[PDB]
Amino acid sequence: RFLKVKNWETDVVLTDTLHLKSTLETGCTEHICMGSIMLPVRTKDQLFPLAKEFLDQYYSSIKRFGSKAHMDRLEEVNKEIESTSTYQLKDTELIYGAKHAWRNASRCVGRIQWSKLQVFDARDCTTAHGMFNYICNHVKYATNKGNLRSAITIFPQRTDGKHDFRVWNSQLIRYAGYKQPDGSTLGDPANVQFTEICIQQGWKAPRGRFDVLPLLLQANGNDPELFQIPPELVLEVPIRHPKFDWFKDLGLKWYGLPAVSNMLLEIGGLEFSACPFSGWYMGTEIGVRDYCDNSRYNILEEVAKKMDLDMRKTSSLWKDQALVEINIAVLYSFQSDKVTIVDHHSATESFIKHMENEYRCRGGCPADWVWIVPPMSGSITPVFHQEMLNYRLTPSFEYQPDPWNTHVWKG
Amino acid sequence: RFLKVKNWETDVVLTDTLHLKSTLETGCTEHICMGSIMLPVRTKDQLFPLAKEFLDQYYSSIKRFGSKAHMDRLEEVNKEIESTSTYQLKDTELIYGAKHAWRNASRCVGRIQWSKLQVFDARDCTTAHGMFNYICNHVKYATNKGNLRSAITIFPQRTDGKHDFRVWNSQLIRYAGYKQPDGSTLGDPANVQFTEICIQQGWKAPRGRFDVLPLLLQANGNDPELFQIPPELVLEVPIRHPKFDWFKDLGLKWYGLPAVSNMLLEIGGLEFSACPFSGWYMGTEIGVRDYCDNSRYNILEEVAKKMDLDMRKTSSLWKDQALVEINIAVLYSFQSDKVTIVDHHSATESFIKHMENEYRCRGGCPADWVWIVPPMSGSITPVFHQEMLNYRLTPSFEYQPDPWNTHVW
Ligand code: HEM
Ligand code: HEM
Ligand SMILES: Cc1cc(N)nc2cc(-c3cccc(CN)c3)ccc12
Ligand SMILES: Cc1cc(N)nc2cc(-c3cccc(CN)c3)ccc12
Ligand SMILES: C[C@H](O)[C@H](O)[C@H]1CNc2nc(N)[nH]c(=O)c2N1
Ligand SMILES: C[C@H](O)[C@H](O)[C@H]1CNc2nc(N)[nH]c(=O)c2N1
C-alpha cells in the first residue's frame, strides 16, 4: 500500500512504502493522535526474531541476502541465543546498527550526515575508569579542535538488566545548575537535579554559572563514579554579538560539542544502555532553547533590557526581537572561532534534500514534524510546509528512565 | 486510557477523559502518525444515530438529559427522518451546534471565545442575491467599525448534494492575484486560480495589487454569481512601522476581517456546505504567512534590503530579523487604527488558559499541536511545551472539495 506526502510550498509529492517495514508502535490510534506527546529483561523467546530481522536487513544492505554468509550467521546467532540467552554483534553489524539507528531517528533534522558516523566499539570496557577513558577519546576525536566529527561510543550491551552500563549525565558536556535558597537558580536550571546528585556523590562544586559537570559513570551495574573531563578537552565558545558590544559583557559562553548520553541504542534486540553520541549544534538549540526557554538561562529579559526594548506590552514582540539577536550572536561567535555550527535555515534545507533522497532510494523517511520544525521562525524554513510521516524503525535510539530512579545501590 | 498531558515548562498535568467520546477518525494508526498531514450524502439509517448523539449531548448541556422534553424531541426527530429522509434543527440546536463546532476545532488557537459566537440563521435563503445580502450583513456586523465580533452565517443544509449552497471564495475578503506575462505574480499568489475563475466568470479586474476579490455565490446548486462587496463594508489597515519610516512606502495594507467561507459545518449528521465564519486575526497569519511565505507575497527580501541587512549568508538571520519587524508593524498598524488583533504570545497564553478550563469543566480539549504553535517564535510561546491530544469531536467544521472541481456546470 502506497502513502503520499505533499510539500505545500513546492507541490512536490513523495510516496512512502517504507512505513510497511515498521514493527514498533507510535502511540497513536485511529481515534487519537499522540503526535505531540514527548514520551509515548528481554528473553530468548522474542530475541531471535528480532535478531533474524536485523540480520536480514544487514545482509540485504551488503547485497548478500540468502547467501551462505547470511545463513551461517543466522545459524551462528541462533545457537548462541539458545545457549547463552543473548548474542554478540560482529563489528560490521554493530557499525551498521549504529548508523541506521541514527538514520531512523525520526526526530533528527541532522540526518543528512548519517552515513558518516565514527563508531567507537567500547564493548571490551569493564570499569568506570575504562568508561572515562573511552569518553575522553570520543570527546577529543569528535571535537577535533573545532572541526567537529560525528562519533558514537558503544559500551557493553545489557545482559540480565542487573549489570547495566550507564552514563548518568544526559550529555557528556553540560553546565551545572544550582538552586539558591532564595529560589533563584545559578547555572543551567536543566541540570539542577543531576548537579545535586553529583555534589552528593562527592563532587566539589565550584558553584559558577558555567561549571562543566563531572562525568558520572556506571559500569556493569555497579555504583557510578565521578570523573573530571580534562578542561583542555572541553572546547567552549565565548558568546559575543557582531553589532552589540555590550553583549560580551553578559558573560555568556557555551561548549562546542553536543553529545547525548542518556539514550538507549537498540540493534537486533540487543540493548546498549550506554552509547554516547555526538555531532555539532544547530544554532537554535543553544540560542533559543538553552538561553531563552523560560525554564533555562532565561536571558531574554536581560538582552531585551540592554536593547532598550518596549517590554511593557508583549505586542511589541520584544521577546521575538531579543530572541533573534541572541541567535545571531551564537552563530557569529561559533563561526568566528571556527567551531562547527549550522543555522536553522541551512539545516532544514539540507534535511528536505535528505528526505527526498531517502524517499527515492529507500522508499521513505520517518520524520517527526513537531520536532523537525525549528523552535523559531518555523514557517520561513522549508520543513514547515512539508508533510511528514512518523513511524518507528529498528535499529533505533530509545529513551530510558534516569538511572537514579531504577538503580539498586551497592554501597 | 484516561490519558494525561504534561506542560514541560510548568509541570502542569491535565487528565483527558473527553477523548473517549470521540466519534470520527484521525488518520493515524498504531504504526503511523499522520499528525502533519494537511488533509486526511447520508442515508436514512446513517442519519438517525448521528441525530440522537447530537440531541443527547444538547439535552445534557441544558441539564435536561433523560427528560420528557429530551425524549419528545428524540421521538420528533426520529419520525421526521423516517418520513422526510432528513430533519431540521431547532434554532436553539442550531446555535449550540455551531458554537460547539468551533469549540471542537482542534486546530484553532482562538477557541477561548467559543461560546460568544453570533449565529446568523440564513436557512430561509434561496438565491445568490439573498446570499450576498446575508453575507453583507455578516461582514458589517462582524467588522463593527474595527471592534470585531465573532459570527457565522448558516445557509440551507445539503439535501441530495445537487442543491448545495456554496461560497466559492475561500474567504469572504481576499486580495486578487494576477499572473504577469514576464513570469511572476502580482497581488496575492495564493489567489491566482480563483482570481482567474472570477475573470473566467466575467469579473473586471482592476489589476492592482490589493484588489478585493468579488464574491462568487452559489445557491441551490445553480451556476454561481459574482457580487461586489461594498468597499465601505471592507475595513482595511494601512501597514506602517512604529520605528521605520520607509516601511509605509512599501505600500502595504491588509483587511481587518478574517472570514473563512469554504468549510463544511456538520451538526447531528446534517451538512451545512455554506457557512462563512469570521473572527479576528492573530498577527502572524498576516505577517508571517500572508506576507513572507514563499508561495505568497514574499516581501522578506525587499524589507531586509531597506533594513540594510547582510543578505549574503543565511546565518546572519536576516530573514528572521525582517520577519520580526514585519510582524511588529502589522500589530502596530491594527492597534493604531483600533482594529481588533491579537499577538501570538497573547493568543497562545489564552489558549493554555482555555485548555485549563476545558479539562476542568469538560474533561479535555482536542488540540493539534502542529497548527496551534504559531509560525514564528514557537518555543517562546507557552503552547510549544504543552503536550496536546488530537481527536475529532462533533459537531465540527470539515474541509470540502473546491466547488469548481465538483459543480455540474
Ligand atoms: C551532526 C549534526 C547533527 C545535528 C545538527 C543534529 C540536530 C538535531 C536536533 C536539533 C535535534 C532536536 C533536539 C532538540 O531540539 O531538543 C535532534 C534530535 C536527535 N538526534 Fe540529531 N543532530 C546531529 C547528529 C546526530 C547524531 C550523530 C546522532 C546519533 C548518532 C543523532 C541522534 C539524534 C536523536 C536520536 C534525536 C531525537 C531523540 C528523540 O527521538 O527524542 N543526531 N538532532
Ligand atoms: C476570534 C478570534 C480567532 C482567532 C484569533 C483564531 C485563530 C486561528 C488560527 C491562527 C488558525 C490557524 C489557521 C492558519 O494558520 O492558517 C485557526 C484555524 C481555525 N479556526 Fe480559529 N480563530 C478565531 C476564531 C474562530 C472562529 C469564530 C471560528 C469558527 C466559528 C474558527 C474556526 C477555525 C477552524 C475550524 C480552524 C482550522 C480548520 C481545521 O481544523 O483544519 N476560528 N484559527
Ligand atoms: C547528536 C545530537 C546533535 C545535536 N546537535 N543535537 C542533538 C539533540 C539530541 C536530543 C534528543 C532528545 C532530546 C534532546 C533534548 N536536549 C536532545 C540528541 C542528539 C543530538
Ligand atoms: C475565524 C478565523 C479567524 C482567524 N483569525 N483565523 C482563521 C483561520 C482559519 C483557517 C482554517 C483552516 C485553514 C486556513 C487556511 N486559509 C484558515 C479559519 C478561521 C479563522
Ligand atoms: C505540512 C504542514 O502540515 C502544513 O504546512 C501546516 C503545518 N502547520 C500549520 N499551522 C497553521 N497554523 N497553519 C498552516 O497552514 C499550517 N500548515
Ligand atoms: C510538548 C512538546 O511535545 C515538547 O515541548 C516538544 C515539542 N517539539 C520539540 N521539538 C524539538 N526540536 N525539541 C523539543 O524539545 C521539543 N519539545
Ligand SMILES: [Zn+2]
Ligand atoms: Zn498521530
